[PDB]
Amino acid sequence: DIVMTQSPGTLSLSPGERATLSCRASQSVSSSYLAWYQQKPGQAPRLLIYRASSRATGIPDRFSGSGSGTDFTLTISRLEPEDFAVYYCQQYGSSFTFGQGTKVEIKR
Amino acid sequence: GSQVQLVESGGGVVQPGTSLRLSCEASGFTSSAYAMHWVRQAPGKGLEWVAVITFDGGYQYYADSVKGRFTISRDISRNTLHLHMNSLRAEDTAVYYCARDPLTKLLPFDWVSGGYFDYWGQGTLVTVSS
């Protein structure tokens, strides 16, 4: 029932730039139970953040999650070549629902 | 073994209205100790949660798009997860991922809090022909 919406649809950036990704829930997310995933082309998703701000093991410091209530943010302080991918948010405060994804692609 | 692995199988080209069973073999962890999920991704679209089975095996929940047609089950003796899909429709075309959830323990209702997905398989593609 909780609808998750991500903005923007696509970010076109050069390596080294900062990326700020937004995720909005239609209802407040209980316990700030919000996760972020990275999905590279042709690969399975990879957990980046859980509980809105906790980094998963092995995730570099340049990734940070923040926010609460309905509005959440994933920040990549400096894009590395391996960071160009699709990013998804997922709430688990009430059942399990994903955002539609934000594509971070190399600027050409 | 040493690394955690999730390996899905069973995908292929299937005709509308038919049935198909997918399997997910886990290694490096005991799948019966975790909530286990199926998550699918239609071509060009985002991730869609499909189904969960709790660690006790007694609770299952499903997305509205598949409820009544799909069944999630587990073979504890073989460390395997299954998705039984009936009455396949064109909108079921997707790669189907098996995923582990280290947080979810109790799910008394379909609206209570759940968990996140810390390990994923590589996926198996199901294509409903036309």
Author numbering:
A (entry chain L): 1 to 108
B (entry chain H): 3 to 132
Give verbatim excerpts from the published study on this entry:
Fortunately, we obtained one neutralizing MAb against IAVs, named as AF4H1K1, which can effectively neutralize H3-clade viruses in vitro and possess the prophylactic and therapeutic efficacy against both H3 and H7 subtype IAVs in vivo. Further structural analysis demonstrates that the epitope recognized by AF4H1K1 is located in the HA stem region and the light chain K1 can modulate local conformation of paired heavy chain to change the protection profile, compared with the non-binding AF4H1K1 single chain variable fragment (scFv) and AF4H1L1 Fab molecules. AF4H1K1 binds most of group 2 HAs with high affinities, with KD values from 4 pM to 49 nM for H3, H4, H14, H7, and H10 HAs, respectively. The AF4H1K1 Fab fragment binds both H3 HA and H4 HA at the stem and vestigial-esterase domains with a similar orientation, where the Fab molecule is roughly orthogonal to the HA stalk.
To further confirm that the different conformations between HCDR3 from H3-bound or H4-bound AF4H1K1 and HCDR3 from AF4H1L1 are due to the allosteric effect of the paired light chain, but not due to that induced by the HA binding, we solved the crystal structure of free AF4H1K1 scFv at 1.4 Å resolution as well. Of note, HCDR1, HCDR2, HCDR3, and HFR3 of the unbound AF4H1K1 scFv possess the same conformation with the ones from the H3-bound and H4-bound AF4H1K1 Fab molecules. In AF4H1K1 Fab, the HCDR3 loop bends backward to avoid the A-helix of HA2, allowing enough space for the bulky side chains of Phe107 and Trp109 in the hydrophobic pocket at the base of A-helix. In AF4H1K1 Fab, the amino acids Gln90, Gly93, and Ser94 in LCDR3 loop form a continuous hydrogen bond pattern with the main chain of Ser111, Gly112, and Gly113 in HCDR3, which drags the HCDR3 loop to fold back so that to hinder the neighboring Trp109 and Phe107 side chains from flipping upward, whereas in AF4H1L1 Fab the hydrogen bond network between the main chains of HCDR3 and LCDR3 is interrupted to accommodate the bulky side chain of Trp90 in LCDR3. Compared with the free AF4H1K1 scFv molecule, the HCDR3 of AF4H1L1 does flip away from the LCDR3. This demonstrates that the conformational change of AF4H1L1 is driven by the paired light chain but not the result of induced fit due to HA binding. Here, for the first time, our study reveals that light chain could contribute to the binding and neutralizing spectrum by modulating the conformation of paired heavy chain.
